[PDB]
Amino acid sequence: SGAIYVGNYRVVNRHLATHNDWANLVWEDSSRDLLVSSTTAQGCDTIARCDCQTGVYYCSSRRKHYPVSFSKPSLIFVEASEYYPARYQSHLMLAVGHSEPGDCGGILRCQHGVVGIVSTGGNGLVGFADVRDLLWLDEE
Ligand SMILES: [Zn+2]
What we know:
The structure is a monomer. This protein is mostly beta strands. The chain folds into two domains: 3-44, no CATH class; 45-140, no CATH class. Helix content is 4%, strand content 51%. The protein is built from one helix and ten strands. It has one helix spanning 19-23; strands spanning 4-13, 25-29, 34-44, 54-59, 64-69, 74-78, 87-96, 107-110, 113-120, 125-130. Zinc ion is lined by residues 48, 50, 52, 110-112. Zinc ion (ZN) binds at residues 48, 50, 52, 110-112. Zn(2+) 1 binds at residues 50, 52, 110, 112. Homodimer. The active site is at 15 (for protease 2a activity), 33 (for protease 2a activity), 104 (for protease 2a activity). It catalyses: Selective cleavage of Tyr-|-Gly bond in the picornavirus polyprotein. This is Protease 2A.
């Protein structure tokens, strides 16, 4: 589980979005596993605006933050998980590390702020759904 709270936006994995998220929908994209809903309270997370390929992510299944190198956001084939079929996922960044389904929503951060949230796992890789291209998160 986990979310990004920026301005009046809540960023979650689409597959974990709640009824309240869908009833307050701003934007969703299945191919990215992202959903954004509107909040009544202002959020304080800073979104990274950068092309960093190093940062730190939270791994709930190890209660640990790991420093990792990660690939640039790309269209990648993801093998079947308990929450998605085998399919292509867009704007996905891979690192070498541990990821289980319950780790979805863990923050990846760099020196510029929030890069993305854990979205995929398995075969010793962790996949992160990038949010750095969503510049509208910072305004309105
Ligand atoms: Zn950065």
